[PDB]
Amino acid sequence: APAPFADFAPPVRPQSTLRRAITAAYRRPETECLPPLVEAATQSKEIRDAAASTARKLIEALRGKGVEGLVQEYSLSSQEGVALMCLAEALLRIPDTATRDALIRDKIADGNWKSHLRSLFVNAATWGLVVTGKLTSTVNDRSLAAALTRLISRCGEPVIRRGVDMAMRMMGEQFVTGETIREALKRSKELEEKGFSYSYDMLGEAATTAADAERYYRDYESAIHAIGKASAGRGIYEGPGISIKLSALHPRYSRAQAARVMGELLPRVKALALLAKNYDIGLNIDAEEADRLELSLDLLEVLCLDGDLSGWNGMGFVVQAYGKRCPFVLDFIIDLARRSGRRIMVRLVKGAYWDAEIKRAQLDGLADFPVFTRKIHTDVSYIACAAKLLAATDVVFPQFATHNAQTLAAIYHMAGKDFHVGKYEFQCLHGMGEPLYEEVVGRGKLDRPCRIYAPVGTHETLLAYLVRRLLENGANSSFVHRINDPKVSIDELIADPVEVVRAMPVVGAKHDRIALPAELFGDARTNSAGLDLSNEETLASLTEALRESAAMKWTALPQLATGPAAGETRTVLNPGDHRDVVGSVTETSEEDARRAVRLAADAAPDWAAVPPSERAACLDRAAELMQARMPTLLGLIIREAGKSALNAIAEVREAIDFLRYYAEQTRRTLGPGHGPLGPIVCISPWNFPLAIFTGQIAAALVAGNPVLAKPAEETPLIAAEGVRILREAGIPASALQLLPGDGRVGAALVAAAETAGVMFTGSTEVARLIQAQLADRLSPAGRPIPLIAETGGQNAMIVDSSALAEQVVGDVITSAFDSAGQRCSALRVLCLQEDVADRILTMLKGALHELHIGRTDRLSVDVGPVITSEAKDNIEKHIERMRGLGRKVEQIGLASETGVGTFVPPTIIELEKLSDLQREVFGPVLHVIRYRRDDLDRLVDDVNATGYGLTFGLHTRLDETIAHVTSRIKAGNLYINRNIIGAVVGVQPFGGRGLSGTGPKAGGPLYLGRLVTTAPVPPQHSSVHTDPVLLDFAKWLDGKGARAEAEAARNAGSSSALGLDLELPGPVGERNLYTLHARGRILLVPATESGLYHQLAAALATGNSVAIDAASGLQASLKNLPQTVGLRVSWSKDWAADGPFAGALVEGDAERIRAVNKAIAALPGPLLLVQAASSGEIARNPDAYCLNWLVEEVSASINTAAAGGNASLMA
């Protein structure tokens, strides 16, 4: 077996001094970046005065001179303008104008456009940007439909015709320079005669499949031939050139795939560069996301050092001045030019991905942003980098891309009075910069050339680039926007950002309204930190720490309060390669499991006496220890549990977040009256072997309970290391005991007499057995043993014809095949609307064939093994049964190296009905169903009908579909236009309903209260809403003289948090929502009339209906019930036939409570959260039944950056 991590992530080449200087600046503090930029950007008072004059002149000329005119002419509202353009766009898809015109004149103009015409409004977000300048992530299609009907009924055929002509002209003339390269070359002559030049971009980026990359390659190749022939030997300065995006040329363009990039992408760029050289035209590599900057430099370096490209100065490269590495990148490029004997064209830009970079750094928990956070900082950076470029015009050709008249004038005077063509040039984007550069090019203006970046193509490739332009055009900080804002004066426009920054009290201070990733949660807690796997320093130090982790002799032992116990001992083997021994585990005898519980019971008063803030301090220290040890922990998780590096980072971050979140929740809530339960048994799954392991233990400890920690049999080593860390942090040995072993060890703990509570995460099947065993037991107070049982999923994603296919496929690949599908949250059923299913499935299969499956100690591995042979056989048996029914089953091929481990390839199975699935299949197996749009409501029924309710995804841009689907789906974690595996602690509190969970959600504010005998009031836990049926019940109680019960009912109505509706703090570009709903139908088992009244008040106040045990004999107690209340009330003789229920309320003595609890455990379907109280307790304690457990939590995470940008960050 190869040495673990020996080939984890070797760099493309050894990092030079100049390359290292780039990497060191990647996330440098903004206060450190700016002072040297300010100094480099400084110009004399003479130049500053001169530049202000020129800038003012330019702005005066621009201010001294489309859809807006169409809106004015027909008095359209904004929504009417958007709807009109959507209609026009659709009408233009009719290829025969005669057919189109007849349809307009005879069907659309008089009556419902709907009857004669996939939503009309799939592209409304884009038209919304065109019409209003604002971007919304999703569209209100009911408002747009209303507006379209209104404008047609008002204005008839003439406005439709104007809309069609206006759409035609915009999509063919304004959005692009031409739809084909030949047409774009024709239209260039007018401005070329005037001294402009051109750089053409065949629109295209982010190849998803091999076929995508090949098509984009062929477009670039055809364009170079056409541009080269048009250039006709004009050369790289006066003749036209081409721009390319590297992400267009390979479906896996990333640092993680560097070997494939250098072996497969580089030769394609070399071939194109060879053509560009042969025609002597410029070829420019566009700059993209920040995590691709340094990788693109390796391609630039190999190209520039290639002798087949010598004698040609047309190699070009963009550097983004909004990036912190920009000046150091320029130092590298200038030196590369000297080393390679060429002149390199350098396009200086600000940058096009700002919103996405802010969101990405926050999601990833990194030290800082790789871009500036104040716009003026970007301006200063640009000026300072222009100074560097102009000092080296002998070896680079500076190309100053900007629409900012102040920026332009600063550089124009910086460059001095000596100019010749070829010294430097300006650049602008087609349809944006011509008015400004009409004031620049020519002997009668500034006499400086400008190259126009010219997008070429049709709507099929237009979207992404067009949105970026429109966002740039409408952003309130953008020059092209401010120049049209009459509220913005010219003196403000010509303000020198270098002097404004120089005069600030803290030079380079971060933007006040953008949180660093560590600060996402403010004063409440510190966010866990990740690791940047695109940073070469990080990859080199990680490589060494990971190799060192593989040399450690990891062990896991039964760690009882008295010390480690002996037992059956065996090796722990890497699931991806059984030759790789990871460590040794000694497993717990059933007798020692029972002994551990007695020891926990003896130690329980000592741990409960540790005050809550000091218990929380233990958790916070443990989080610091894990953060510091993250590199080592990653290596163990990678080798023990089949995880990739990214998977393992998420695992450790999640454990850190649980620790700090439950610590903070404890400091917010727990006091002396919130007594611990006693010894708590924590039983955890293999698939999140540190995160959920740590989360359950940490919550139980901080609530004051000693813990018996029973990790899954497959993954004991990381659990032992987690226990070592918690003990190191101050948890006493007697308060936290580790009991490795199989399910028999779990069962022995669950059954032990002093066990006071059980926290279980695992399969629904095992949870049912645990609930059965617990129903035989009672606390010494005569009440049920609390059980949190978070179980399996059958998770669906619904995709309609308005979704963006590329985005769907990325989120599907992640949701279904991340960790080989071994997430409880994993996508199991992809539901595709029929008319887009084939296209999406073709793209999905193409993306599947680009995944690398193998042993996970290489950065290039995407998908790891399944945990055991047993798991592998269980998965393959399902795939066989599906094959046996004639279902189409497709799999990707596995390399022969996977033979020493247990791997299952990503598998796609086409179903006929959702009922084909009978059970959670915990592996890389995605099932697909197609649906007709009119069947959407019934499809949601079919998803709900499995009985599960964990995660659920919806991809749509239509608000009506979002509203419909999210009001009808029954799942605990919802995700809109993103993947469905998010579980960020305190942001997406995670946990489901039905067969998926009892609740309360891990990582949410109700969790700790289940682990004490008297639950606290969580932060922000209240509601001003009062259930109206509860109100009617209280009135009926008053009407029959039951004054004390009516009072209790009104008190329950107020205390209920039903209707809570909160936005949780999280990253930008996302809205994370947390709401409290009714649970459903509650089984009521009363003993007395007043007991029944109290149970009814509790259930009604929380929005529930009820089934009352008919054997109670209390039927006469509810005569003359108001219809509103009776509508919520049924009587049950056979509880099993009237389910499923969502909880239960029991009244009786200890004997009755146990008898009822056993019968409830016997019920089919979901595990029920049961609450019990004696008659005297109901009379004495108004909180005898806790309303926390009668509501259901729902988390919803909405990607609001999905349409292309961030609307709040546009401000």
Ligand SMILES: Cc1cc2nc3c(=O)[nH]c(=O)nc-3n(C[C@H](O)[C@H](O)[C@H](O)COP(=O)(O)OP(=O)(O)OC[C@H]3O[C@@H](n4cnc5c(N)ncnc54)[C@H](O)[C@@H]3O)c2cc1C
């Ligand atoms: C011909 C041409 C080619 C280009 N090629 C590329 C390319 O290959 N890759 C690429 O990424 N960009 C590229 N750009 C730049 C990008 O597309 C925008 O056009 C450019 O950033 C706008 O800058 P400005 O001087 O026109 O306008 P301005 O209004 O002066 O500057 C706007 C810019 O400031 C930045 N910014 C906005 N808010 C903040 C903030 N809060 N904190 C820090 N910075 C902020 C953003 O970069 C924004 O685009 C190109 C631009 C042109 C004209």
Ligand SMILES: NC(=O)c1ccc[n+]([C@@H]2O[C@H](COP(=O)([O-])OP(=O)(O)OC[C@H]3O[C@@H](n4cnc5c(N)ncnc54)[C@H](O)[C@@H]3O)[C@@H](O)[C@H]2O)c1
């Ligand atoms: N709802 C959630 O948040 C969530 C999170 C992660 C995983 N899961 C679920 O966990 C499962 C995967 O983990 P797993 O394969 O390790 O599950 P599992 O049910 O096989 O095993 C879970 C744990 O229970 C123990 N166990 C087994 N039999 C027992 C018994 N009779 N009595 C007491 N304990 C017993 C196991 O040893 C292990 O520690 C999947 O079903 C997955 O969906 C749910």
Ligand SMILES: O=C(O)[C@@H]1CCCO1
């Ligand atoms: O694609 C973009 O938005 C930038 C601008 C032109 C090239 O890269």
Ligand SMILES: [Mg+2]
């Ligand atoms: Mg198991």
